[PDB]
Design a protein around this ligand. Sequence first.
Ligand SMILES: O=C(CCCCCONC(=O)c1nc(-c2ccc(N3CCCC3)cc2)cs1)NO
Ligand SMILES: [Zn+2]
Ligand SMILES: [Zn+2]
Ligand SMILES: [Zn+2]
Ligand SMILES: [Zn+2]
Ligand SMILES: [Zn+2]
Length: 354
Amino acid sequence: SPITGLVYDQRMMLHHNMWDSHHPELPQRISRIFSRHEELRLLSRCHRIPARLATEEELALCHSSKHISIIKSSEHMKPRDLNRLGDEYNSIFISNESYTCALLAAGSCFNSAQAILTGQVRNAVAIVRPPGHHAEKDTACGFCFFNTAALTARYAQSITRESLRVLIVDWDVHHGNGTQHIFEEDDSVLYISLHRYEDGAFFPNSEDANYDKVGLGKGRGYNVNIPWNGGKMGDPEYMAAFHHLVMPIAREFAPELVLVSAGFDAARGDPLGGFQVTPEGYAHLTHQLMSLAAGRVLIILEGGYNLTSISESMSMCTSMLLGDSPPSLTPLKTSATVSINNVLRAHAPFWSSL
Ligand SMILES: O=C(CCCCCONC(=O)c1nc(-c2ccc(N3CCCC3)cc2)cs1)NO
Ligand SMILES: [Zn+2]
Ligand SMILES: [Zn+2]
Ligand SMILES: [Zn+2]
Ligand SMILES: [Zn+2]
Ligand SMILES: [Zn+2]
């Protein structure tokens, strides 16, 4: 009867860094977001979707059995061994609760996707950790263990039809390399990422994130990278990318389900991103995406490390999902226009609306 679903479970707080309790991927990222939804009176307006563990068979939709095996083995490791295993990846910490939390993150999003696709709710928001989009088929990376968003997209296909057109918009400030690679040869899933690039000087520090990686084989044109260079990007920049690139392509793709890899580390005040997108900015992005897929949008928390900025930003997205009017509203930075024009040029061969 509520149109918007919401999934949050404090067990996902159990994932922690044993050797640095102040690591930015904090447990209270999700609880602060949830707590803010309560303050802004959005929680009463949402249907509460239960969290569940993703099954191993569901993980296998995207991830190798080897990968699965290793992350599962972490459950019964001593601190010394957690430390060792952790340091085999780029930017990873592990606790005994990490695996459960990563399962909970994915399963929550599966339930949310199922609630949308069965008409229980129109749209949903997933306040989950740890994040997902850096997770490859074979490896963890960048605080991510499994690719929640990628898995949810496959889950959706498997409970509907395999050709179900799924759009993934990734506005985390980092490139979702794992998501890109998983669907790199897929024309049924459209990946669109905006991220700080700085010619590969920004994590995850690869040319994979550049505008010229457009997908492979059948997937040619179904991977859209929008890299930012030499600019403190904000609302004008993201609004322009949406108007010129994201929304035109998305409309032409005509998805049946929209998944947002919603990192809020492009927000003003975020220590890792150093960009200045506002909560109102994020609202207007959500609002625009809701014109797709009859409003069937699933917002999935990725990055974002300023507790105030992420709590405010994500609550605003939920407000849009609930059907509220956007809050109101600077000329575009040059380098942003350079970036946009490079992407227009690279994707003109695929999308006629460009
Ligand atoms: O978001 C993600 C995943 C993030 C993975 C990024 C790379 O791996 N790790 C990092 O960069 C880290 N950097 C910090 C850090 C940097 C700057 C500051 N500060 C600058 C000013 C003062 C405070 C504080 C903390 C902690 S770890 N995916 O979407
Ligand atoms: Zn309200
Ligand atoms: Zn991104
Ligand atoms: Zn693709
Ligand atoms: Zn591209
Ligand atoms: Zn990020």
